[PDB]
Amino acid sequence: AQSVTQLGSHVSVSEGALVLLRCNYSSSVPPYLFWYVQYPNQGLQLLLKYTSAATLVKGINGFEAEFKKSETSFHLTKPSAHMSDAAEYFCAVSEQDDKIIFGKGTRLHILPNIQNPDPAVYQLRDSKSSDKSVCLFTDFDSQTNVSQSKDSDVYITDKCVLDMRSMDFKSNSAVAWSNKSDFACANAFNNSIIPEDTFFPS
């Protein structure tokens, strides 16, 4: 019964902190082991592999992994999490002397260090002369998360992190919108726990 197990479909790390993605395998004889990365919108790239040579294996970009037979592990590490490390990571193992079998994958989410949060809910208007708008919740730190909508006619996206290279500046945001007359940006995020100091302009 040869398999490979990764723990958690989605995991978080603080920007700047140790990256640790776990992998264990079930083969009795030590297998070959592989770590692949899939950056958003792309195919698979090999980071590193264990091929019964060194047990500490080094990869590209400061990634490394130690093969530990006694705990049947091959955990991928990197010393410091950068925003560009956001991707999905797959551990894989040789099987039946004839193929590689893949783990289910773990997506790494990097939580930006937001030193001076400025939570706010803004209203944005359509560039064309409709009476249409959306609501933008932005500039909150790591301790805020956005809930799904409670009203079927109000749409709310997941939080998304943008990295403005021009000002070396990262920020979180979520978008909400609705086709209703009822709908005000003051109420758009009422099902989310928002910072007590969120800015709501007039």
Partner: protein, 240 residues
């Protein structure tokens, strides 16, 4: 090798036979077809070690394959069904587990082509209150009313593609989640300095590449045939 797969994107109706082709230049004995699905990783469909040597993987049901040359390994959906919607990857290997993956085939299988629909796209201009409070300006793009979920969204500033300052939702949402053929929506943000938004020379465009019908597909409705196309929306910077 240069491992190459054909096609790169395809939409099909249910019940049709669909063929995906993998070709290599290095002549490795070992060739593989996998599918990728969210939360499941890459699962092996079939593999081959030479012409006329064929071995089932874990999810071979509904598929067939043929190894018609050292260089070529073909995958068929025998009678396509919606749960065969996936990203499909070919691979080759040497004798020491040196894998080479193709770049992928994005296949979507839909029950009824009459439901295919290109997005409507709108750009929402930055708030004056954001500008005043932060000296930054967030544009929002909203793509709505599309089906199936087979799009690519990008931003273009003064005619060149940008990646900095952008965040696009990783999956669209369903507009009517209680429906099996609900249309979809997707948002994206592009954030710039207020100074850059305030320049009336600067041009901002959200582009959505949509994959839908081909020229070959029949269309019997009065509304526009929902072919593969690009839909954009734009805004110019504003000083006032």
């Amino acid at each position: 090798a240069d491992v190459t797969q054909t096609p790169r994107n395809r939409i099909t109706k249910t019940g049709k036979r669909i063929m995906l082709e993998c070709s290599q230049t290095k002549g490795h004995d070992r060739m593989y077809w996998y599918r990728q699905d969210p939360g499941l990783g890459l699962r092996l469909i079939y593999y081959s070690f030479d012409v006329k040597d064929i071995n089932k993987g874990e999810i071979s049901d509904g598929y067939s394959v043929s190894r018609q040359a050292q260089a070529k390994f073909s995958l068929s959906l025998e009678s396509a069904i919606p749960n065969q919607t996936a990203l499909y990857f070919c691979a080759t290997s040497d004798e020491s587990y040196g894998y080479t993956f193709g770049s992928g085939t994005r296949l979507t299988v839909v029950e009824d082509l009459n439901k295919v629909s290109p997005p409507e796209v709108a750009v929402f201009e930055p708030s004056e209150a954001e500008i005043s409070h932060t000296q930054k300006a967030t544009l929002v793009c909203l793509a709505t009313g599309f089906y199936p979920d087979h799009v690519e969204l990008s931003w273009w500033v003064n005619g060149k593609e940008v990646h900095s300052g952008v965040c696009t939702d990783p999956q669209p949402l369903k507009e009517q989640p209680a429906l099996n053929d609900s249309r979809y929506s997707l948002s994206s943000r592009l954030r710039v300095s207020a100074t850059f938004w305030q320049n009336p020379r600067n041009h901002f465009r959200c582009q959505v590449q949509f994959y839908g019908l081909s020229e070959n597909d029949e269309w019997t409705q009065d509304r526009a045939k929902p072919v593969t196309q690009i839909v954009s929306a734009e805004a110019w910077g504003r000083a006032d």
